């Protein structure tokens, strides 16, 4: 492939959504348009187990794969959109997203600017604890 | 047995005693 | 007045199915359609009939604005057979509910 753009040093930008649950990890390369997904590797493919699917090892193995598929298609740089399940659930990103940011920087894929788009509600409808909440 | 659930059992007993009174008046 | 000249949210009654049929939908005592979601070109109009199914009608048809008087008629328990009997005696013989 002759790819999108040649004469580099001025990077071709993409957008890396990362969706860290506490028990799954997404890395999702899009361009700036928003609709056109290049690559979607989860933590749920690279991990054969069913609880280390949120690990840094889950994330970094997801991070190698996308950066490899992005080294083929000729795009160079990636902005970073970042989140967790922010409806009524927790708002910290999990222990994987803070590690996939490391491994994207290692295997190619130079970095744009990073933003924290976790959708913060205003109304906050009822969260699933009950009255007395979670027990043990 | 809590005084909470002690009140509930005195209630549950009294309601059957009530429906026994109103049965054979 | 036509539905293309009222703003959306207008609670109307006796509006028309297709224009020039002189009043068909939402005529009974205490019913109302409410014009929502105009289409500027392709002159059409979504309306919530008194069921809840949004029909889209042609927007040259006219609707007398407001609810039909007699709203909340059925709130009286008829409560005796004769008053059940006289209601349907003026209408038609549809009364014999023999199971």
């Amino acid at each position: 492939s002759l790819g999108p753009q040649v004469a580099e040093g001025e990077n071709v930008f993409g957008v890396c959504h990362i969706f860290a649950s506490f028990n799954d990890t997404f890395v999702h390369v899009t361009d700036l348009s928003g609709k056109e997904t290049i690559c979607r590797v989860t933590g749920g493919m690279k991990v054969k187990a069913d609880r280390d699917e949120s690990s840094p090892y889950a994330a970094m193995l997801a991070a190698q794969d996308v950066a490899q598929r992005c080294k083929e298609l000729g795009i160079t740089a990636l902005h970073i959109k970042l989140r967790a399940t922010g409806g009524n659930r927790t708002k910290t990103p999990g222990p994987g997203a803070q590690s996939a940011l490391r491994a994207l920087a290692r295997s190619g894929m130079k970095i744009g600017r990073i933003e924290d788009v976790t959708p913060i509600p205003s109304d906050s409808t009822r969260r699933k604890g009950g009255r007395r909440g979670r027990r043990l | 047995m809590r005084a909470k659930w002690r009140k509930k059992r005195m209630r549950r007993l009294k309601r059957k005693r009530r429906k026994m009174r109103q049965r054979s008046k | 007045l036509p539905v293309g000249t009222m703003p959306e949210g207008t609670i109307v009654c006796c509006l028309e199915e297709k224009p020039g049929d002189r009043g068909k939908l939402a005529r009974a005592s205490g019913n109302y359609a409410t014009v929502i979601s105009h289409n500027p070109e392709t002159k059409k109009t979504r309306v919530k009939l008194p069921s809840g199914s949004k029909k889209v009608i042609s927007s040259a048809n006219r609707a007398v604005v407001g609810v039909v008087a007699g709203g909340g008629r059925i709130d009286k328990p008829i409560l005796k057979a004769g008053r059940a009997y006289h209601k349907y005696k003026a209408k038609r013989n549809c009364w014999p509910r023999v199971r």
Binding site: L82, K91, Q98, R113, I114, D116, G129, G133, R134, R135 | - | -
Partner: protein, 97 residues
């Protein structure tokens, strides 16, 4: 007897404060009773910013922060080891160093 003069919360002139749904166990605790903190956590942990400072287009102009109103209840506070026990004169005491 009274373990505290506050009786835990800080409703003093009022009669009713809205509950804030907790984060961990999601038990609704009124906010003047709840354990309350605010963390300016950096978006990348500082060992890995040096990766990202050297792999960026800009001259380390990109430095963003992650603000969380992080909101605990008093059952899951000590259960997560924030709000250590103190002593009978040490309950009187105020803001940490």
């Amino acid at each position: 007897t009274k373990k505290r003069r506050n009786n835990g919360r800080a409703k003093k002139g009022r009669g009713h404060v809205q509950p804030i749904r907790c984060t961990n166990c999601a038990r609704c605790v009124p906010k003047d009773k709840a354990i309350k903190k605010f963390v300016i956590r950096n978006i990348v942990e500082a060992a890995a910013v040096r990766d990202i400072s050297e792999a960026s287009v800009f001259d380390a102009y990109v430095l963003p922060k992650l603000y969380v109103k992080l909101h605990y209840c008093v059952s899951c506070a000590i259960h997560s080891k924030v709000v250590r026990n103190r002593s009978r004169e040490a309950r009187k005491d105020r803001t940490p160093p």
